[PDB]
Amino acid sequence: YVIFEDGTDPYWARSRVLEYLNQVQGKLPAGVSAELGPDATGVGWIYEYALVDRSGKHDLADLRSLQDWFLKYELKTIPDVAEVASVGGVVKEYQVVIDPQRLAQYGISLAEVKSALDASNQEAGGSSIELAEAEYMVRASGYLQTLDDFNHIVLKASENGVPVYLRDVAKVQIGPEMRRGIAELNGEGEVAGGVVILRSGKNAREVIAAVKDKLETLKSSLPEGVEIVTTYDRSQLIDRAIDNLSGKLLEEFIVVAVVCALFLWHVRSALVAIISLPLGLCIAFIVMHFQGLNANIMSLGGIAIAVGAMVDAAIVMIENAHKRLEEWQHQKTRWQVITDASVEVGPALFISLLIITLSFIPIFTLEGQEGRLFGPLAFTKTYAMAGAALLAIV
Amino acid sequence: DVQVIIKTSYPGQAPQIVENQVTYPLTTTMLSVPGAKTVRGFSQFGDSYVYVIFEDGTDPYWARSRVLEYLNQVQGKLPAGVSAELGPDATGVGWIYEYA
Amino acid sequence: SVLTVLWPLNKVGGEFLPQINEGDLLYMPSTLPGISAAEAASMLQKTDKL
Amino acid sequence: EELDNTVRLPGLANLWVPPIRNRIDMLSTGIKSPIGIKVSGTVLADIDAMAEQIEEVARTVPGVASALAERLEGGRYINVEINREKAARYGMTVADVQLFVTSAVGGAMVGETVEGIARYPINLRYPQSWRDSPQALRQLPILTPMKQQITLADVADIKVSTGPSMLKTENARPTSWIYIDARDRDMVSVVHDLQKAIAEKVQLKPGTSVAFSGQFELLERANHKLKLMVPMTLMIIFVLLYLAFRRVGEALLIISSVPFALVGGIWLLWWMGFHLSVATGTGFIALAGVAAEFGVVMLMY
Amino acid sequence: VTSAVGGAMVGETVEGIARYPINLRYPQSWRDSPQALRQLPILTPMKQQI
Amino acid sequence: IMSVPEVARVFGKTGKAETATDSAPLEMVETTIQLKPQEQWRPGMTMDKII
Amino acid sequence: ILWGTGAGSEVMSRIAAPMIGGMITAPLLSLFIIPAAYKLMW
Ligand SMILES: [Cu+]
């Protein structure tokens, strides 16, 4: 892991890291290679799905192979899905197992056997030729694609002969490649599948949606007796949480309307309360967009309690407006004088909203992981409050 | 539009082992690159040209920078001497002056 | 008079987006896959004559 | 016209384009064709068979078009089938056999020579004479690790087959794109008839998928977004019409107005038999701007 | 120690668009326990059996 | 885990999973438990209670 | 722009044409949508 100071253009930071990643590739082993991480954070684990079979026809190794060279390719296509992890299953493996006694007898060392394998599985062609008029491309395959072929690898042979083959000192058998990650579903057990990961910052909900349509569409192609059982759907917590805040806000308008009705015995405050919020709400959503923050539970939590502290400007304005009218009920320009005194109640009110916002900065000051977790709730509010002050004046 | 060209030459060969050998490792490593829209490449007799398309309006140099991320993980997996080339820096418009 | 303009809108006259003109021309002919390099250089020369 | 008529030969269909546009057209990868489909798969054989079966469904569905399955496999080959077992009897590695296939019969450059600031290639190959024809190949002389003197035919069977002239693939794996072309009509309906008619009464092979692409994907979006713009553009236009004089009668007049102003312009398309373009629509947009102005200036008076 | 007793993959096999590993190792029986290791049979550059 | 009547699906993962993100040995047992709407299936039984 | 163009006017014309025709109709319309339509409006 390479850690950078908070708030560094990630892609930039990833770019810098690479600088010296190239100076190293040659210094480490053969085949062994260095991998740069994905592109998502630890949050990026969005959708997880198991690949099980409602029968016994399709193999464990078969499933892993299905998820690896089919599904994974199908889903990585989807927009902001960084990578589609593969989990569990088992790897179809071609196992050449030597027999020491057979080696002794024929007198061929391991080095010899290894050199043969590296020289028994390749393909090549060497230019074209002018037969007739058209040119022909000349190819060849030495391709290991049958156990017959695995067996028929010459090791030691001689003139006028016999030929010692690999079949002669080893048994070639498909097997399970030494496991590094085992996955399972319920008591039933042992099953392969894959996780979906979100390329940093991009409404996970949508990414899940795009995935789910694909899966629905794909299930047609699936072999017989295999089901994609969802193990995870971040969308649900997102939906649940979002529907939660969708309700509280309306519930807040009605509560306010009811309380108003009891205090001013009914008044268009209904539309007034509802107008003040969405606007002070709509500025918070205008600003966060610009400075591209998020929409995490915190940010949403911010606007919620803001609604609660934006009542006084509306309440205080109205009272003074209501009291100013009554003076003319006791006895254009005359609606203007009612405004004038709505102006007398303006100054300090207005300024009280502005003074409220600034005090929040100490919260920004804390700089833990938690502190940065809370920045949202405070960032949304801090910017919503100042705009709420202008809000109040409009 | 915004794209990154990845030419790979092979002295002589064939449409199968020019892909199987060099572009099969090239196209597949590029699937994971941050921001890649579609990774469609043309393999052919002797050459492997691989295009990476990005969404319209992406800092080209940035886009070219991202592409490179995984271009390094591949150099060792393809043949000897055979090497991967990042495109030039001009678009299809860039062909200005031609002289015999 | 808007009617008289409407008969047109459905007929649209003829053709769509242009292609524009440059001082020169480029020639490319679907040709078929396999050929010789010599036969290529030959055809090239003949074409440069026509 | 003269050129197209002057230069004419077999196998060649002439195309005449300008410099800039051509160069642009030779990099922008995709499908000019209004519509096409992609069948992704694990092996060339599978997805190819799909194109064949889809073709009939293309010609059949109400829609004029020519389905281009695979103008690709026009490649002439010479398969050198190395019989491992016969190479074994000679104590030879498939690689060693290929040594002759690649260097002796190809000419794989075995290094280059530095002349200061320049380097030219070094080529190691059998004489031109021995690489002349398949027969030549069959008789290609090989000397074994045991100074046995044999011929490529002894360890290989060479056959002439016809395969790919090139290989195109979408996202690592192989996909064939069939081009179906319908012209001058918004064919957004056809793509849905196919995606469902297929499922209901036409099958498929596990290990593959089907993708629909063409000029329409982006077009449909363009149309969609444009049609959101007209309500939004009118709403702002209305707010900008109503504010100089307030009344809706005039503002509604101007809106109900513009269409007739557009007449002369399109009747201009009439002598000219003029196409129409985003450009003609660009003029229309400007026309409608000046006329609206004229209405305003006159209404005030 | 690495191939016979480990199972260091000595290459993979291309099935179109997929590749599985090839593993070269002594029989499961000879890698069972430290004792097994002590008796792990080696044949020298001189066909000596140790 | 599946025994509990308040758990829906369950997923056992032991180790890593073909991704640079996960770095867990074969010891590292890592399971995802899926829960049902508290419509089901119990009276009381709060989150910490389940736990 | 209509009579000659050695430098790309397959496009300038396309947007130019509408302008003229509309400019023969536009003056006229401005003239007779102003009075008639007005008295009809009220
Ligand atoms: Cu863990």
Swiss-Prot record, chain F:
It is found in: Cell inner membrane. Induction: Transcriptionally regulated by CusR in response to copper and silver ions. The cus efflux system is composed of CusA, CusB, CusC and CusF. Belongs to the resistance-nodulation-cell division (RND) (TC 2.A.6) family. Part of a cation efflux system that mediates resistance to copper and silver. The cus system plays an important role in copper tolerance under anaerobic growth and, under extreme copper stress, in aerobic growth. This is Cation efflux system protein CusA. It comes from Escherichia coli (strain K12). The chain holds residues 596 to 646 of 1047 of the full protein.
